[PDB]
Amino acid sequence: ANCERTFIAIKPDGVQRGLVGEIIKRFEQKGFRLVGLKFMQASEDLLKEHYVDLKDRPWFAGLVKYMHSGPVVAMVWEGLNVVKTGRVMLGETNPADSKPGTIRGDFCIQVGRNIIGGSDSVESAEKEIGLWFHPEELVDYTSCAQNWIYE
Amino acid sequence: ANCERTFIAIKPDGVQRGLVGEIIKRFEQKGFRLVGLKFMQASEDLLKEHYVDLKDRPWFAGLVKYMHSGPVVAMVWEGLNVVKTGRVMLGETNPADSKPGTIRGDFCIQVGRNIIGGSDSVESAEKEIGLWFHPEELVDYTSCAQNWIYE
Amino acid sequence: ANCERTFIAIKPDGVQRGLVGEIIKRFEQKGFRLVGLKFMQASEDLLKEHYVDLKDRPWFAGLVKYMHSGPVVAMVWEGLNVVKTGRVMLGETNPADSKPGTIRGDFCIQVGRNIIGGSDSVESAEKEIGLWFHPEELVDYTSCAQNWIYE
Amino acid sequence: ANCERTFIAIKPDGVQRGLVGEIIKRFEQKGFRLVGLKFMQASEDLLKEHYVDLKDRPWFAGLVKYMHSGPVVAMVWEGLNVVKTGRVMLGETNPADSKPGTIRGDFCIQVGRNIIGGSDSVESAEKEIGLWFHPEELVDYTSCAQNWIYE
Amino acid sequence: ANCERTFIAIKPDGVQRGLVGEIIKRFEQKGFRLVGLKFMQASEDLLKEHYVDLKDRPWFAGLVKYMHSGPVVAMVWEGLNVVKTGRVMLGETNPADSKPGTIRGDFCIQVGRNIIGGSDSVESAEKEIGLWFHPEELVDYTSCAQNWIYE
Amino acid sequence: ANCERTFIAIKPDGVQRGLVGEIIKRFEQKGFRLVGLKFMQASEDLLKEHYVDLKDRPWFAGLVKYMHSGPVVAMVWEGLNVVKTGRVMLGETNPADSKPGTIRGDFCIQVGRNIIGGSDSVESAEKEIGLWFHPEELVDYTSCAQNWIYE
Numbered sequence: 001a002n003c004e005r006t007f008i009a010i011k012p013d014g015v016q017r018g019l020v021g022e023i024i025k026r027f028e029q030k031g032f033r034l035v036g037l038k039f040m041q042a043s044e045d046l047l048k049e050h051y052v053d054l055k056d057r058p059w060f061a062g063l064v065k066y067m068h069s070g071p072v073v074a075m076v077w078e079g080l081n082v083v084k085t086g087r088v089m090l091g092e093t094n095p096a097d098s099k100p101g102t103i104r105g106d107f108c109i110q111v112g113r114n115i116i117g118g119s120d121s122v123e124s125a126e127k128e129i130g131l132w133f134h135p136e137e138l139v140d141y142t143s144c145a146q147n148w149i150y151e
Numbered sequence: 152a153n154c155e156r157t158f159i160a161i162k163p164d165g166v167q168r169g170l171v172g173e174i175i176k177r178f179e180q181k182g183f184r185l186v187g188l189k190f191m192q193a194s195e196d197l198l199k200e201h202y203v204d205l206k207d208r209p210w211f212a213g214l215v216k217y218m219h220s221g222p223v224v225a226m227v228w229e230g231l232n233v234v235k236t237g238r239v240m241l242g243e244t245n246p247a248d249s250k251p252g253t254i255r256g257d258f259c260i261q262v263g264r265n266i267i268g269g270s271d272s273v274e275s276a277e278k279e280i281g282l283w284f285h286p287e288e289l290v291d292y293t294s295c296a297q298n299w300i301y302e
Numbered sequence: 303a304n305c306e307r308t309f310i311a312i313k314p315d316g317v318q319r320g321l322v323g324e325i326i327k328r329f330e331q332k333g334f335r336l337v338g339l340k341f342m343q344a345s346e347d348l349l350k351e352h353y354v355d356l357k358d359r360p361w362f363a364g365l366v367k368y369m370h371s372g373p374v375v376a377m378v379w380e381g382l383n384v385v386k387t388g389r390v391m392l393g394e395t396n397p398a399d400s401k402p403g404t405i406r407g408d409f410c411i412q413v414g415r416n417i418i419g420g421s422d423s424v425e426s427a428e429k430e431i432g433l434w435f436h437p438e439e440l441v442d443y444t445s446c447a448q449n450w451i452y453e
Numbered sequence: 454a455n456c457e458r459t460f461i462a463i464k465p466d467g468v469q470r471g472l473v474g475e476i477i478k479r480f481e482q483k484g485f486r487l488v489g490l491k492f493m494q495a496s497e498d499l500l501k502e503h504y505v506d507l508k509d510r511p512w513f514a515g516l517v518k519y520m521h522s523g524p525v526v527a528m529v530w531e532g533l534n535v536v537k538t539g540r541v542m543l544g545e546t547n548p549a550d551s552k553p554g555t556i557r558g559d560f561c562i563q564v565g566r567n568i569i570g571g572s573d574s575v576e577s578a579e580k581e582i583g584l585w586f587h588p589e590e591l592v593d594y595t596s597c598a599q600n601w602i603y604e
Numbered sequence: 605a606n607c608e609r610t611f612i613a614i615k616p617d618g619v620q621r622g623l624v625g626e627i628i629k630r631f632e633q634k635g636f637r638l639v640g641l642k643f644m645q646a647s648e649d650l651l652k653e654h655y656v657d658l659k660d661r662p663w664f665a666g667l668v669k670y671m672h673s674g675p676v677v678a679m680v681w682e683g684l685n686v687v688k689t690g691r692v693m694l695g696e697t698n699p700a701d702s703k704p705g706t707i708r709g710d711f712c713i714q715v716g717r718n719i720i721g722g723s724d725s726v727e728s729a730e731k732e733i734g735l736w737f738h739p740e741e742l743v744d745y746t747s748c749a750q751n752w753i754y755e
Numbered sequence: 756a757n758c759e760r761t762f763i764a765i766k767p768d769g770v771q772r773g774l775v776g777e778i779i780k781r782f783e784q785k786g787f788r789l790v791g792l793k794f795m796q797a798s799e800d801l802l803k804e805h806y807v808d809l810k811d812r813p814w815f816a817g818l819v820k821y822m823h824s825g826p827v828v829a830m831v832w833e834g835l836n837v838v839k840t841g842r843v844m845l846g847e848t849n850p851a852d853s854k855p856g857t858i859r860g861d862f863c864i865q866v867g868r869n870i871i872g873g874s875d876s877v878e879s880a881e882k883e884i885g886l887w888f889h890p891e892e893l894v895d896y897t898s899c900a901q902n903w904i905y906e
């Protein structure tokens with residue numbers, strides 16, 4: 001049921017504070033399927049383009065510097081409403097406003113170090129996925145539990 | 152304290168995806184007392200009797216058929232306001248509306264495969280408990296942590 | 303694969319200390335298939351027969367009296383070499399000799415309060431299974447992960 | 454970053470039910486820094502002063518008597534907005550109103566046995582910290598993750 | 605202390621049974637640093653070369669077919685004795701012989717489906733890493749906890 | 756039962772890497788009773804007194820210096836054979852020799868940064884308990900699970 005996808009990245013602090021496994025586990029246990037996984041050092045050009053809608057924000061320059069200061073984990077997840085639900089799972093932009101149970105709510109404190117980010121919408125998702133992944137990187141397969149996750 | 156009881160069932164998908172232990176731990180750690188526990192394949196009759204209020208629903212048959220497609224874990228839990236809080240712990244009928252931290256919110260995606268279900272009123276609870284369990288299958292015992300869970 | 307089965311029981315102390323979910327989780331994560339599951343208070347007759355081989359031990363009377371003092375969770379698990387491996391998973395008879403990582407090693411201390419028990423041979427398992435369960439109580443189904451657990 | 458501090462105490466029932474490690478783990482994983490930690494049996498005088506603001510509640514006598522019936526784990530945690538967020542992490546006063554994902558929501562049921570407590574304002578936190586700890590008991594150090602938690 | 609590396613791959617069953625997060629978490633919590641992470645569909649040529657030392661084994665053809673039947677997660681970890689210790693963490697080749705606590709011991713049953721594999725030695729490790737990763741894929745950075753993991 | 760006690764300390768690296776909760780949970784879930792708990796920075800004198808038997812060791816100074824470099828969590832735990840089993844739970848002096856499932860085995864790598872330590876004999880235990888704790892810092896209480904942990 002629905003092969004909608006979404007882009008999710010584990011920021012540098014998430015990697016530094018050893019939360020990669022915990023984060024990946026949350027999507028797996030949820031029932032979403034992993035299609036892309038990459039550990040890299042995103043270039044500013046890549047970052048600037050990814051965060052184009054915020055190019056004019058006072059903190060923009062800081063966001064790019066930070067996201068570029070260390071390696072990240074780029075990921076792509078598939079599932080019904082994965083974009084909207086993914087957002088719920090990460091929690092509000094500001095950790096202070098993220099509810100316990102969400103990724104940001106349980107593991108971080110400051111907005112400038114909120115360990116993870118994702119896609120805001122479907123359109124944005126496809127656009128972002130293409131920006132980070134080459135079509136030959138999105139592995140396709142069927143989950144042995146697909147029939148128990150979807151009717 | 153309180154002797155209120157509720158009926159909770161781990162659905163076929165819940166069993167198939169290996170969430171039995173996880174779900175039971177949720178109730179144990181909360182302080183609720185396990186009263187009845189049985190692994191079974193619910194007969195089509197039992198299920199129709201159980202979901203009666205949904206008989207004339209545009210998907211009743213698909214529901215009854217699915218719940219009959221595999222074994223389930225039928226449970227009875229005891230504790231102050233267990234019925235109401237049990238519902239909270241489960242989350243919303245639609246996993247997309249269930250908050251992270253809840254069972255449906257953390258472990259599933261679609262309403263048709265929402266891994267678990269439970270009584271939504273003290274009246275329905277007793278009714279359902281009478282339908283799925285024989286009185287001798289409800290065990291009476293006192294938790295050693297009794298005085299630390301209740302005033 | 304393999305349809306070998308084993309009988310495993312979570313003792314009264316295992317239930318009292320809230321370890322039911324944790325224990326079930328370990329057999330589920332291993333790949334074993336849950337076949338039977340019941341919450342009950344074993345009668346002294348049932349217990350004396352189950353432990354007949356120990357009928358002449360100094361501690362036999364104590365074991366029976368104790369195993370009858372509270373409810374136990376009786377289970378039947380299926381899988382390749384489930385009997386021998388289930389034993390490895392439980393740990394040694396004396397928790398003091400059990401290795402960290404095992405059920406007894408991680409969760410208990412004294413031999414007389416060792417939270418769990420299980421068959422030690424295929425022959426005994428089938429005898430015990432027939433002793434604690436009615437044929438209709440053992441459910442047959444196929445794990446959606448079957449092909450990924452067994453070649 | 455921020456050096457705001459908060460006082461949090463694991464109540465007698467929290468200790469009795471083996472939740473000390475679990476609770477500490479939640480503040481550590483969030484990014485907060487442990488500043489003070491002591492296991493003690495609070496005297497009635499200390500408790501009456503700590504809860505002075507509730508001195509006129511019908512349940513005040515009961516609270517004091519109860520909070521004095523067993524040992525508690527007193528703690529001081531540091532971090533940006535630790536006071537307000539610590540409160541969010543604990544859940545609501547009445548466990549029934551606490552959301553899954555919160556400490557009270559996940560681990561307890563009744564208001565009189567709600568396993569944990571903490572400051573509700575910066576002013577109160579500093580008063581309580583000074584009340585329960587000696588200055589030399591509050592340790593100053595720098596988290597190796599400092600730069601990845603705070604910008 | 606020591607930048608020795610090692611190659612570790614999460615076989616297709618490990619991916620299918622949602623153990624990616626759990627596995628990654630075990631290396632992070634251990635203290636090892638992640639340098640490479642890739643989700644792919646290893647070609648037979650790649651596989652045949654990787655398993656050259658077993659080219660003549662009766663089950664070789666089966667191993668290649670299986671490892672190629674689905675996507676895997678290639679990884680590279682750094683740390684003192686990571687190759688030898690990694691081996692310990694995965695557990696024996698045959699799950700039946702893997703101790704509880706190890707990855708294979710806790711999560712799988714059959715040798716033909718032992719969810720994970722790694723490098724047998726340092727030399728082999730470098731060789732294998734080169735075979736799977738392009739020098740421009742092994743991200744290098746320093747852990748904020750490096751001084752607490754090594755003297 | 757048994758009133759034997761042992762001294763366990765979470766080292767500076769243990770605190771720095773956020774393993775306090777994890778470690779305490781290990782002892783709580785096993786059934787041991789928490790007797791003393793204090794967060795402190797051990798003075799150089801105390802440490803020399805504690806590691807006396809290692810004074811004339813080629814790395815005594817580096818040890819004493821390190822243990823003084825940051826706060827530690829000093830603990831006293833009670834239970835049948837706690838000293839001996841506590842050592843088992845910790846693992847081997849060298850993490851590379853510690854089996855998965857143990858604390859050192861699961862969470863650290865080098866002997867110089869082995870996150871935890873504890874008494875290795877009943878004699879040393881009492882000696883060390885007298886060195887780190889004031890008699891009033893050892894709390895006496897009875898676990899509600901007392902009868903389910905010990906015969």
Ligand SMILES: Nc1ncnc2c1ncn2[C@@H]1O[C@H](COP(=O)(O)OP(=O)(O)O)[C@@H](O)[C@H]1O
Pocket residue numbers: 059063092093094111112113114116117118119120
């Ligand atoms: N007010 C802010 N101050 C600093 N950084 C911010 C602020 N708002 C957003 N950011 C940063 O920009 C990232 C992208 O913003 P946005 O996409 O709007 O939120 P989200 O990542 O939660 O979807 C955030 O994850 C955060 O790191």
Ligand SMILES: Nc1ncnc2c1ncn2[C@@H]1O[C@H](COP(=O)(O)OP(=O)(O)O)[C@@H](O)[C@H]1O
Pocket residue numbers: 210214243244245262263264265267268269271
């Ligand atoms: N719109 C729907 N589409 C498919 N299945 C549904 C739908 N609504 C409800 N169901 C199924 O019927 C079950 C019973 O519904 P109901 O009792 O009303 O909600 P709940 O089980 O959450 O209390 C649900 O758990 C779900 O499996």
Ligand SMILES: Nc1ncnc2c1ncn2[C@@H]1O[C@H](COP(=O)(O)OP(=O)(O)O)[C@@H](O)[C@H]1O
Pocket residue numbers: 356361365394395396413414415416418419420421422
């Ligand atoms: N020395 C003993 N003292 C008390 N109880 C014992 C003793 N030895 C064995 N028992 C009890 O008898 C049970 C059955 O023994 P056995 O089946 O031989 O070991 P296991 O339970 O590990 O399969 C044990 O689980 C334990 O509860």
Ligand SMILES: Nc1ncnc2c1ncn2[C@@H]1O[C@H](COP(=O)(O)OP(=O)(O)O)[C@@H](O)[C@H]1O
Pocket residue numbers: 507512516545546547564565566567569570571572573
């Ligand atoms: N109605 C009540 N009955 C019994 N105890 C209560 C009641 N209301 C509050 N308490 C107790 O008083 C404590 C202190 O109250 P308060 O500080 O206002 O809430 P909180 O503990 O959530 O900060 C609560 O944690 C609870 O143990």
Ligand SMILES: Nc1ncnc2c1ncn2[C@@H]1O[C@H](COP(=O)(O)OP(=O)(O)O)[C@@H](O)[C@H]1O
Pocket residue numbers: 663667696697698715716717718720721722723724
């Ligand atoms: N006897 C066997 N039968 C089937 N498959 C085997 C056998 N021995 C090894 N294999 C497979 O080949 C893989 C590589 O073997 P090897 O590298 O020797 O062991 P390990 O992966 O544990 O290092 C194993 O992980 C397993 O999948």
Ligand SMILES: Nc1ncnc2c1ncn2[C@@H]1O[C@H](COP(=O)(O)OP(=O)(O)O)[C@@H](O)[C@H]1O
Pocket residue numbers: 814818847848849866867868869871872873875
């Ligand atoms: N060879 C070594 N090199 C460095 N530090 C060591 C060495 N041997 C021991 N240590 C340190 O000294 C501590 C005390 O040693 P010891 O008490 O003999 O072992 P254990 O603490 O495991 O009981 C160890 O925990 C470790 O931190």
Ligand SMILES: [Ca+2]
Pocket residue numbers: 117118119120
């Ligand atoms: Ca975004």
Ligand SMILES: [Ca+2]
Pocket residue numbers: 268269270271
């Ligand atoms: Ca319902």
Ligand SMILES: [Ca+2]
Pocket residue numbers: 281282284285286
């Ligand atoms: Ca009836």
Ligand SMILES: [Ca+2]
Pocket residue numbers: 419420421422
């Ligand atoms: Ca036995």
Ligand SMILES: [Ca+2]
Pocket residue numbers: 432433434435436437
């Ligand atoms: Ca029979």
Ligand SMILES: [Ca+2]
Pocket residue numbers: 570571572573
């Ligand atoms: Ca308060």
Ligand SMILES: [Ca+2]
Pocket residue numbers: 583584585586587588
């Ligand atoms: Ca003071």
Ligand SMILES: [Ca+2]
Pocket residue numbers: 721722723724
């Ligand atoms: Ca190998």
Ligand SMILES: [Ca+2]
Pocket residue numbers: 872873874875
């Ligand atoms: Ca020692």
Ligand SMILES: [Ca+2]
Pocket residue numbers: 885886888889890
């Ligand atoms: Ca003294």
